[PDB]
Amino acid sequence: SGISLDNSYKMDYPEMGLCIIINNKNFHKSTGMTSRSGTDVDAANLRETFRNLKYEVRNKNDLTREEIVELMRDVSKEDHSKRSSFVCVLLSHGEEGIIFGTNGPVDLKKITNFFRGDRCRSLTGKPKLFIIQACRGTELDCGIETHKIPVEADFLAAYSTAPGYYSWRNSKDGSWFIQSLCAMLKQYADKLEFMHILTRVNRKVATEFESFSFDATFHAKKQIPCIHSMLTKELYFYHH
């Protein structure tokens, strides 16, 4: 045949892959964590968005830390041979490096490790996408008025917010980040490479949202999401 290029992931396997959505809204009272109003709006938007991208979506609600780990372990032991990619969306409270089960925290690194190149062989070389709506600390952005491959290769973490910072969720509309992510996927998934989509999400969150609060400490604050890419190829959700 003629000259070939392989700058982009193979996305024409029989299946796009799983989209696991962990929607933690209600937490055990002993944790003292508040209910995450608006997260169901997020979970529904994601389900529909990834459905239209032809992902096999599985929604899970209010999982304990044990259930999260067991789920990730189990999913990582499925046969993904006929799948192009893997997507996991986490909606919860969080801190840097951490997301909360309903009864306590889970290490993000622990979750992604199940899908390591050496630990999930049917996903080796395929894009493994983790989308995380959760705080990463308690900073507020005040804004300004204008042979082998690495086992950690082919991961992408799309964080809702910068490291160290709160992440914002609207109780009526859903979270700024997930709102924006679904909108940009709907508008551009048939047009743009995924980093360029996520860059549009960065701009949308950064420009269109600003907190309103009766509390001066939490009023008029801004947010910028953070793309964490260890991908080795371009990712298009469509194929030729």
Partner: peptide, 4 residues
């Protein structure tokens, strides 16, 4: 608006 609430924080996570």
């Amino acid at each position: 608006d609430e924080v996570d």
